[PDB]
Design a protein around this ligand. Structure first.
Ligand code: HEC
Ligand code: HEC
Ligand code: HEC
Ligand code: HEC
Ligand SMILES: O=[P-]([O-])[O-]
Length: 90
């Protein structure tokens, strides 16, 4: 099976690469700060990412314990109008 995104990161840097005291925060804010410490901000990302700057945390799409390395978030998790990744090109 492909590895979970959480475990892929834990192999590099442990659970504490994302979690303070290794325990999850109530709101995901700490974790989101950690994603950005290594990845930077949505403001500097591509056409699917940048429109979400100010609306979402990375984990809202890339749910690390539930999604695998390489797994593409699908837009139907939140938008009901049938848009897909190519919709930002049109
Ligand atoms: C960043 C890439 C992460 C790593 C590395 C680990 N976790 Fe995590 N975890 C992360 C997020 C963003 C969230 C919350 C959002 C979500 O999709 O759940 C979590 C959540 C947990 C939880 C709560 C689980 C739940 O209530 O469903 C636990 C107990 C947790 N994480 C533990 C954990 C451990 C032990 C890790 C090292 C093996 C670990 N996480 C890595 C982000 C990341
Ligand atoms: C630094 C300590 C990091 C933290 C905190 C988070 N990420 Fe990360 N991520 C990091 C690196 C160096 C890499 C590339 C590693 C490699 O060997 O390729 C990544 C990769 C991802 C990926 C892509 C996985 C793939 O498909 O190959 C995603 C989607 C990703 N990271 C998301 C992510 C999120 C949502 C985080 C916070 C919850 C997060 N990362 C934390 C370094 C670090
Ligand atoms: C949902 C609106 C998303 C949010 C919020 C974030 N990401 Fe994302 N990411 C998303 C999609 C749909 C895709 C796939 C794009 C495609 O069609 O290929 C991605 C891809 C990444 C990747 C690349 C993974 C790879 O294949 O190499 C990385 C590294 C990644 N996303 C990281 C990332 C981070 C760090 C975010 C918060 C700053 C973040 N994403 C938010 C959808 C969404
Ligand atoms: C929930 C985790 C989401 C997923 C998955 C995707 N999007 Fe999203 N998107 C989301 C929110 C909460 C918002 C803000 C909406 C608001 O009313 O402020 C957005 C916004 C966009 C936008 C910008 C506004 C718009 O023109 O609709 C675009 C272009 C957009 N989203 C596209 C999009 C695509 C193509 C996705 C799949 C790759 C996608 N979103 C996933 C929440 C979520
Ligand atoms: O190798 P394990 O993190 O799936």
């Amino acid at each position: 099976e492909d590895q979970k995104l959480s475990d892929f990161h834990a192999d590099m840097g442990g659970c504490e690469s994302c979690h303070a005291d290794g325990s999850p925060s109530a709101d995901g804010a700490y974790e989101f700060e950690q994603c950005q410490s290594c990845h930077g901000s949505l403001a500097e990302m591509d056409a699917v990412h940048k429109p979400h700057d100010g609306a979402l945390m990375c984990a809202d799409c890339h749910a690390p314990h539930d999604m695998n390395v390489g797994q593409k978030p699908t837009c139907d998790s939140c938008h009901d109008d049938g848009r897909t990744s190519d919709s930002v090109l049109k």
